[PDB]
Design a protein around this ligand. Sequence first.
Ligand SMILES: *P(=O)(O)OCC(C)(C)[C@@H](O)C(=O)NCCC(=O)NCCS
Lengths: 128, 192, 96
Amino acid sequence: LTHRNKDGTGVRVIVAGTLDINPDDDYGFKQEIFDVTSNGLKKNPNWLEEYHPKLIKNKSGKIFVETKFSKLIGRPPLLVPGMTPCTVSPDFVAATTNAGYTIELAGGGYFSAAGMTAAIDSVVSQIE
Amino acid sequence: STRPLTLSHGSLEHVLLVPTASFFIASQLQEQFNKILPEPTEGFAADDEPTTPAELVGKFLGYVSSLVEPSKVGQFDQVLNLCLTEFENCYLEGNDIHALAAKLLQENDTTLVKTKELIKNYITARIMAKRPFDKKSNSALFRAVGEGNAQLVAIFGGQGNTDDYFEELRDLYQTYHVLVGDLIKFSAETLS
Amino acid sequence: ASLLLHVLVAHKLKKSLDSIPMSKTIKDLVGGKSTVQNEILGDLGKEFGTTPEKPEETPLEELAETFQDTFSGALGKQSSSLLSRLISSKMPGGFT
Ligand SMILES: *P(=O)(O)OCC(C)(C)[C@@H](O)C(=O)NCCC(=O)NCCS
């Protein structure tokens, strides 16, 4: 009961009264008390510290919100998503990409490989 | 000057090195033990029959521990003391019994009832053969609290958590008889 | 899956294969003791692998389908181990 109240604060519950095995391995049983190896000291995640948003700079000196997602793409953690009328235009996809933000070209406004390929080519021609 | 003895049940065995000084005792226990435990069946699934070498040695430690006296130095004291020292050096590799009971449960096809008795047997044996727990164990968790990594808090429950709490007192007393027997006894007197 | 699930639940409740109606949640059948509830969920975890979210809130009838898809007449870990006990522990005295 206490475990579920404070999943994601960085607290491990050990049920000191019973020996069993947790498949999830969310909380411990008696073993964790007695065990001598590193399988006695296990910690539970502290989401506020694991996934704390940070800042960070280029050689250029240009600040970024650092997160799991921005660290992968090298751009701010903001995406304009695929909208059928709105991000069908390769002139919009290009402007948003140029700016420095992630954007989906929208399949939903294209009816054939030929038609989309012409669109994707019009994007590639305009971006850096 | 030693001599081999082989505790076995169906397909699995532990080979046991008895000083020949006290062999005519041990071989008499071996045959008496080898008739109580049942007919080997595939998987070793039935609750009584042990499933690993580690359980078979434990089943023995229990059967021997059931013939010793805690005061009177009998014949079986040195027999038991050289089943323990085998069991502790093969299958515990300087861990706790609980850490072993866990391993068997997620590796092998043991059950809970099967692994509860192994903990009863070993902890009974440790006390029937005057080897009381006195070493400050190297528990990873408590090495970690000394160092100042881990903070611990104790919490105690109340009524509502189970239909029959009293099965918890029965299962606790069945298994740690030899550790709690004195506290139970004290409460029974103090309430009465 | 609809038979296997019924049997796994029936066996854990010490109850007959028709005294459990399939149109009923797992948290309904063992409403009292919460231990048995999770212990059933632990068994379905081993048996069929991946579960829905809050499986003890969806009727066995409804939950049997969700398994029927990604499972293929496989007895797997838990059920095999329950039969291994049933035979050896009961008295098919010699015949395994
Ligand atoms: P399960 O999910 O039902 O297990 C949890 C529990 C309901 C047993 C537990 O949360 C519980 O006991 N709830 C109420 C707490 C309680 O028992 N209070 C004490 C009465 S003085």
